[PDB]
Amino acid sequence: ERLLDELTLEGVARYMQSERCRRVICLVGAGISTSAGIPDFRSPSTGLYDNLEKYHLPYPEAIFEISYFKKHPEPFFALAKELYPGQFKPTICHYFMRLLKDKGLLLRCYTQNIDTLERIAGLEQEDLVEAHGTFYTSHCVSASCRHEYPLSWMKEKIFSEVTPKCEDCQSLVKPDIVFFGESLPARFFSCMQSDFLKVDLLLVMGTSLQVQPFASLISKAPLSTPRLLINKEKAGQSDPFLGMIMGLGGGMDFDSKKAYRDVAWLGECDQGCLALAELLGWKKELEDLVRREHASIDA
Amino acid sequence: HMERLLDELTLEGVARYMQSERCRRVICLVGAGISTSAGIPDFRSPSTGLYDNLEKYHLPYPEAIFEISYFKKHPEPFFALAKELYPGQFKPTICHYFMRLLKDKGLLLRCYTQNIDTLERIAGLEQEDLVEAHGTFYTSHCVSASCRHEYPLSWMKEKIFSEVTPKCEDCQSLVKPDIVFFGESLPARFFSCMQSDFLKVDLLLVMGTSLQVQPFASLISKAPLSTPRLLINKEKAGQSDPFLGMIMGLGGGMDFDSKKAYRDVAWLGECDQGCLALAELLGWKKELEDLVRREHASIDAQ
Ligand SMILES: Nc1ncnc2c1ncn2[C@@H]1O[C@H](COP(=O)(O)OP(=O)(O)OC[C@H]2O[C@H](O)[C@H](O)[C@@H]2O)[C@@H](O)[C@H]1O
Ligand SMILES: Nc1ncnc2c1ncn2[C@@H]1O[C@H](COP(=O)(O)OP(=O)(O)OC[C@H]2O[C@H](O)[C@H](O)[C@@H]2O)[C@@H](O)[C@H]1O
Ligand SMILES: NC(=O)[C@H]1CCCc2c1[nH]c1ccc(Cl)cc21
Ligand SMILES: NC(=O)[C@H]1CCCc2c1[nH]c1ccc(Cl)cc21
Ligand SMILES: NC(=O)[C@H]1CCCc2c1[nH]c1ccc(Cl)cc21
Ligand SMILES: NC(=O)[C@H]1CCCc2c1[nH]c1ccc(Cl)cc21
Ligand SMILES: [Zn+2]
Ligand SMILES: [Zn+2]
């Protein structure tokens, strides 16, 4: 069933202004924060996974892999000390999602990021699913213990160059950011079970959709729900190939003759959000919000 | 409405379903575990699997040897393994001949195989019965997309057993057999058969696979929600809690053991013995045994 009058940004904008479009879910990744100075993972040359050579890893992902971590925790904590102190401000894209909230359209933002820029831009707890966790809290990795530690305790250890250990059981303690091999937060599953039943539009921004189960989210919406991708490159579309991340047919179809609801706007997330905001008549409103908020942070 | 087709979640329940009028079309989903009893190692069995046995090639990770990007940078390890695996002949197993019985009883809609050993064909399945999902070593191709010149089996055998890394005659790019590496497209037949077959499948028989690679792993989720799915395998496969980096799409797995289980059965053991057990329940045990004896004797005839 086809709800967009045309498969373009303009078509998505007209749909957003129709009575049909009440509930919008944003699905976001590291691409929405590169313009703020935080590298992504998988972009050639600049991405984090192309810049870990000094840690002497078997493959880049090992630095956030739970089995490797337990055996060799030192690289992760060395990287954490290098990355933690960074100070960053939300992007136009983050403020666009804030505007969706204030306009009453945002059902939920599911984020793969741990930078907290969604919260800094003014989205609240109930608007967010921090799918790949948070550094705000930390836990002992032992399943029979799971002692919780606050951010202050973790910083005390990290910047003291002591490998954080649990005071009860001496097991490693790590921030609640989700590693390969680890469970996702309970909130991911409880929100996912209900949010996708009546969603009217998916807005996918700044992600390569290369990790499960987050990549499955696009297939959870009803088949009639349009999906707009704002990203530098097409993501989620391919023929069947061995080792593909998406389930069979769970991807996007922007370009086949059977394409009916997916739109790819290729370019920078910030510029896509500006372009869409203009089509919605919100451009002036977004720009002021950005300027005031960036000014407020500088103070 | 959820149609509960199995009267109990057991091999016995599955056999009763198979004998009913409701079970007309079976799809078999198979992997390397159906050929280990013939002498061919699997991939992911601890210690014995191929991926725990590649140390001498000093690969970055085991899957690199069957990965197209790595291959293009370092093709020698693949061909050095291909020398170690191209020789030797194998006979089909009881499990292969069980699939042959399904064919000859008009029950086999399709066998989707991740194997390149061709044992399904040697067991008497014909081309139309089969989706060789991960390719064939019978044909080869230049890796350059603009070229893609095809080369026959003899050409590839000539090059590999000359210990020369095969290059394309039209463009000098690497040539490899049409077995599917990580990063490579599956044959178009895979998708075309899947879209049709999975609309009309009455039972999935999943044997000898860990379901750890996509898109093959997705096939279980393409069956109608009521279609029972029987796993015959050493270990449970396709049933796990979600985690970051999981292979299956969310909700796309087997459910043998939860409070909501209604159609998935795991029979844990060797595929040959599981097929014998099932055949005995169906009244086919002697027929199967006779078939295996006959066909093996015939192969030994030359
Ligand atoms: N300014 C920009 N505008 C538009 N697109 C951009 C921009 N910057 C980057 N991109 C695109 O943005 C995308 C960034 O893709 P990836 O780097 O894979 O990050 P993820 O968040 O999806 O990684 C997911 C998980 O993987 C990790 O293991 C962690 O667990 C992560 O949480 C690319 O398509 C870029 O082209
Ligand atoms: N005799 C046996 N009986 C029953 N189960 C067995 C037996 N032998 C092994 N097993 C089980 O059989 C399963 C073997 O699983 P895997 O070794 O992953 O092989 P695949 O075919 O799924 O590999 C898929 C692709 O991955 C590669 O990259 C290639 O591309 C492959 O085509 C395990 O669960 C064993 O416990
Ligand atoms: N610095 C920040 O505002 C954020 C920015 C995103 C990356 C990041 C932050 N905090 C971290 C703590 C530990 C580890 Cl391993 C990574 C990070
Ligand atoms: N901008 C971000 O927050 C991205 C990029 C900074 C490192 C990071 C991000 N997402 C993550 C999810 C899990 C883990 Cl372990 C680390 C990260
Ligand atoms: N030997 C056989 O009948 C088959 C048996 C399965 C493994 C195998 C065969 N042929 C091959 C050609 C190349 C590579 Cl890399 C592997 C194989
Ligand atoms: N029994 C088999 O055919 C298995 C085990 C032998 C090597 C092998 C099998 N399946 C494959 C699929 C792709 C590639 Cl590149 C290699 C193989
Ligand atoms: Zn503890
Ligand atoms: Zn060529």
Residue numbers in the entry:
A (entry chain B): 56 to 354
B (entry chain A): 54 to 355
What does the paper say about this structure?
Sirtuins constitute a family of NAD+-dependent enzymes that catalyse the cleavage of various acyl groups from the ∊-amino group of lysines. Sirtuins consist of a highly conserved catalytic deacylase domain of around 275 amino acids that is flanked by unstructured N- and C-termini that differ in their length and in their sequence. Of the seven members of the human sirtuin family, Sirt2 is mainly found in the cytoplasm, while Sirt3 is the main mitochondrial deacylase.
Using the diffraction data obtained from the soaked crystals, we were able to solve the crystal structures of Sirt2 in complex with ADPR and either EX243 (EX243 is the S-enantiomer of EX527; Sirt2–ADPR–EX243 structure) or CHIC35 (Sirt2–ADPR–CHIC35 structure) by molecular replacement. The asymmetric unit contains two monomers that show no significant differences [r.m.s.d.s of 0.29 Å (Sirt2–ADPR–EX243) and 0.23 Å (Sirt2–ADPR–CHIC35) for all Cα atoms]. The ADPR molecules of both structures assume a position that is almost identical to that observed in the Sirt2–ADPR complex. To our surprise, each Sirt2 molecule contained well defined electron density for two indole molecules. One indole mimics the physiological sirtuin inhibitor nicotinamide and occupies the C-pocket and the adjacent extended C-site. The other inhibitor molecule binds to the selectivity pocket of the hinge region. The carboxamide of both indole inhibitors binds in a similar fashion as the carboxamide moiety of the physiological inhibitor nicotinamide and hydrogen-bonds to the highly conserved residues Ile169 and Asp170 and, via one of the water molecules (W24 in Sirt2–ADPR–CHIC35 and W206 in Sirt2–ADPR–EX243), to Ala85, Ile93 and Pro94. The amide of the indole hydrogen-bonds to Gln167 and, via the other highly coordinated water (W3 in Sirt2–ADPR–CHIC35 and W203 in Sirt2–ADPR–EX243), to Asp168 and ADPR. The binding of the hinge molecule is mainly driven by hydrophobic inter­actions with the side chains of Ala135, Leu138, Tyr139, Phe143 and Phe190. The hinge molecule may supposedly be of no physiological relevance for Sirt2 inhibition, but it highlights the adaptability of the hinge region of Sirt2 and the selectivity pocket.
